[PDB]
Amino acid sequence: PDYHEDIHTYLREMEVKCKPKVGYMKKQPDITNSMRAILVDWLVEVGEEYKLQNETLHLAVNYIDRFLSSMSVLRGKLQLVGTAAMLLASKFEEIYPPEVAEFVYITDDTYTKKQVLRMEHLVLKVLTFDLAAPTVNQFLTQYFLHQQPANCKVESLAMFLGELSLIDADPYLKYLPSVIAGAAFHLALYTVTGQSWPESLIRKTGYTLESLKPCLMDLHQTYLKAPQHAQQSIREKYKNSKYHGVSLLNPPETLNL
Amino acid sequence: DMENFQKVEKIGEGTYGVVYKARNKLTGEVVALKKIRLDTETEGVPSTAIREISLLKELNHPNIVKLLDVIHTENKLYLVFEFLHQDLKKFMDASALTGIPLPLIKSYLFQLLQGLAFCHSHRVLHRDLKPQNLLINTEGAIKLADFGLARAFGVPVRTYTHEVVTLWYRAPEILLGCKYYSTAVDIWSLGCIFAEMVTRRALFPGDSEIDQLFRIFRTLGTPDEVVWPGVTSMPDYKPSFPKWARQDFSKVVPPLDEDGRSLLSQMLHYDPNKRISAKAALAHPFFQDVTKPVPHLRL
Numbered sequence: 001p002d003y004h005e006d007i008h009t010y011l012r013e014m015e016v017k018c019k020p021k022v023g024y025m026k027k028q029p030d031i032t033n034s035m036r037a038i039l040v041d042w043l044v045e046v047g048e049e050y051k052l053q054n055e056t057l058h059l060a061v062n063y064i065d066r067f068l069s070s071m072s073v074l075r076g077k078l079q080l081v082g083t084a085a086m087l088l089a090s091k092f093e094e095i096y097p098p099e100v101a102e103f104v105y106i107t108d109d110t111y112t113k114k115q116v117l118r119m120e121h122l123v124l125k126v127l128t129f130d131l132a133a134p135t136v137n138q139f140l141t142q143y144f145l146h147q148q149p150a151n152c153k154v155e156s157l158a159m160f161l162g163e164l165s166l167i168d169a170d171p172y173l174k175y176l177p178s179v180i181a182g183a184a185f186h187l188a189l190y191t192v193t194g195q196s197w198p199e200s201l202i203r204k205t206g207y208t209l210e211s212l213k214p215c216l217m218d219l220h221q222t223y224l225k226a227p228q229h230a231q232q233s234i235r236e237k238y239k240n241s242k243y244h245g246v247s248l249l250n251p252p253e254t255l256n257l
Numbered sequence: 258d259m260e261n262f263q264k265v266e267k268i269g270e271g272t273y274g275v276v277y278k279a280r281n282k283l284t285g286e287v288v289a290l291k292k293i294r295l296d297t298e299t300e301g302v303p304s305t306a307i308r309e310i311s312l313l314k315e316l317n318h319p320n321i322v323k324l325l326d327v328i329h330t331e332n333k334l335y336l337v338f339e340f341l342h343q344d345l346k347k348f349m350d351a352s353a354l355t356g357i358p359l360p361l362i363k364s365y366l367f368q369l370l371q372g373l374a375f376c377h378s379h380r381v382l383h384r385d386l387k388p389q390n391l392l393i394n395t396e397g398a399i400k401l402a403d404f405g406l407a408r409a410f411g412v413p414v415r416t417y418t419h420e421v422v423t424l425w426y427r428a429p430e431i432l433l434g435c436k437y438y439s440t441a442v443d444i445w446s447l448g449c450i451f452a453e454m455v456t457r458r459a460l461f462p463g464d465s466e467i468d469q470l471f472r473i474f475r476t477l478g479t480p481d482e483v484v485w486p487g488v489t490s491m492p493d494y495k496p497s498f499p500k501w502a503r504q505d506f507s508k509v510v511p512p513l514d515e516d517g518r519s520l521l522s523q524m525l526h527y528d529p530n531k532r533i534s535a536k537a538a539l540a541h542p543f544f545q546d547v548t549k550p551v552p553h554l555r556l
């Protein structure tokens with residue numbers, strides 16, 4: 001709009017504050033990056049079953065990561081956390097969220113309605129009701145306006161890469177949303193059209209191909225290996241025709257950096 | 258903790274719950290205490306509360322009601338707000354005889370645009386701007402309240418298949434059924450409230466979606482592809498719409514000078530892309546001489 005720049009600046013401010021402890025997992029006695037990846041991959045499925053927005057998925061992971069940043073959680077309860085996170089993200093983001101009953105259903109009656117609402121209370125307390133966090137998604141949406149010709153395969157592919165980034169706390173927990181979005185938008189744009197991170201976005205964000213390079217190196221690595229990843233729900237989702245089957249596209253053999 | 262408030266009187270009721278005026282027994286502070294009852298087995302914390310709380314504590318501003326505290330017990334959720342004396346609906350009603358002084362209208366519309374410009378710059382749509390959701394104190398201040406319908410739009414906000422904004426203040430784009438909200442629908446509402454303060458009467462008191470659309474058409478003229486590129490392609494637009502002509506604005510709002518009319522016509526612009534922004538409205542000449550009168554409030 002007329003606030004496009006005011007909001008980007010504010011998102012950039014906020015993403016630094018709504019940031020989770022990059023090393024929380026080492027301090028966590030009983031769970032594991034692999035358990036978390038299994039969890040996030042499950043949340044993607046749930047999102048497909050109940051037809052939730054991508055933004056909801058991103059917010060939920062933000063919530064889970066901030067929450068695990070200050071609370072020890074055992075294996076058997078990690079899914080209860082993730083379920084309450086998804087529920088909260090839905091209330092915040094969806095036009096109307098599934099009711100609690102439906103989140104208890106897809107945990108397979110491992111947990112109770114009562115437990116999930118109890119956990120909702122606790123997550124709200126721990127996050128002090130601060131739910132409007134910036135996400136890769138929000139930054140990708142800003143960046144998309146700066147396509148001279150808008151290209152739908154590029155948008156889907158960028159979304160795909162951003163979402164893959166949610167699976168692996170290492171490395172991505174150490175990058176900011178605006179930066180991951182940068183790498184994701186460049187890599188997608190380069191893969192589909194051959195174009196590169198555009199000048200206008202350099203001006204908008206102050207990010208240069210040079211500064212994205214580290215995150216861009218990781219994202220390319222992830223992209224190349226995605227078919228070998230134990231977690232496959234994102235690749236499956238992104239062969240849908242609503243995403244132009246982009247996850248079947250071949251990743252570039254080399255960037256040109 | 259909840260022991261330290263004394264309830265003084267009910268000041269609000271709704272689907273949402275109740276609001277009491279209350280007194281902090283220890284500090285003496287006077288507060289507006291909203292009580293929500295929780296469904297502890299099948300609902301949890303309601304979505305409007307999730308959104309009101311988390312958005313409202315990002316928006317610290319003098320023209321946006323201040324959320325002072327949240328108390329979350331087993332079954333009750335309390336929101337503690339700053340207390341204001343009166344909403345703008347009851348003041349507009351109390352002032353139907355004498356009218357609201359133009360100096361005061363300018364003050365309020367200046368303030369409201371400040372609170373609104375602040376929301377939009379922090380990617381928040383209010384989406385329910387209407388007279389009784391705006392609050393006034395005795396020192397001449399007015400603040401945006403009731404953010405139950407507010408949304409963050411860092412990602413675009415999709416339009417409720419079954420509408421949202423109370424009908425009289427609802428914007429053409431929504432009635433014609435566009436896919437997304439924008440900041441412009443908040444401006445529209447504010448234009449209507451503006452006019453309504455000037456004329457003592459609701460600008461577009463429609464009886465139904467379609468009657469609303471037409472009352473608008475009869476005052477602003479029926480939009481075509483020149484005045485609004487794309488109207489004729491919108492889902493709920495029909496080519497079988499009667500062509501009305503644009504009413505002259507000195508008849509629509511007489512009491513206004515050349516500046517007041519200019520601003521209002523920019524807030525009521527058909528194409529949302531062209532409808533004046535709140536940041537820009539504040540730069541308008543109309544506000545060059547603005548001041549801060551104090552209302553005479555009949556409590």
Ligand SMILES: CNC(=O)c1nn(C)c2c1ccc1cnc(NC3CCN(S(C)(=O)=O)CC3)nc12
Nearest residue numbers: 268269276289338339340341342343344347403
């Ligand atoms: C969802 N609802 C809300 O969020 C809400 N509803 N009300 C009535 C108020 C809200 C928020 C803080 C408030 C702070 N002060 C006041 N004061 C009252 C409003 C105006 N009048 S009145 C009825 O005489 O015009 C009495 C005092 N009301 C507040």
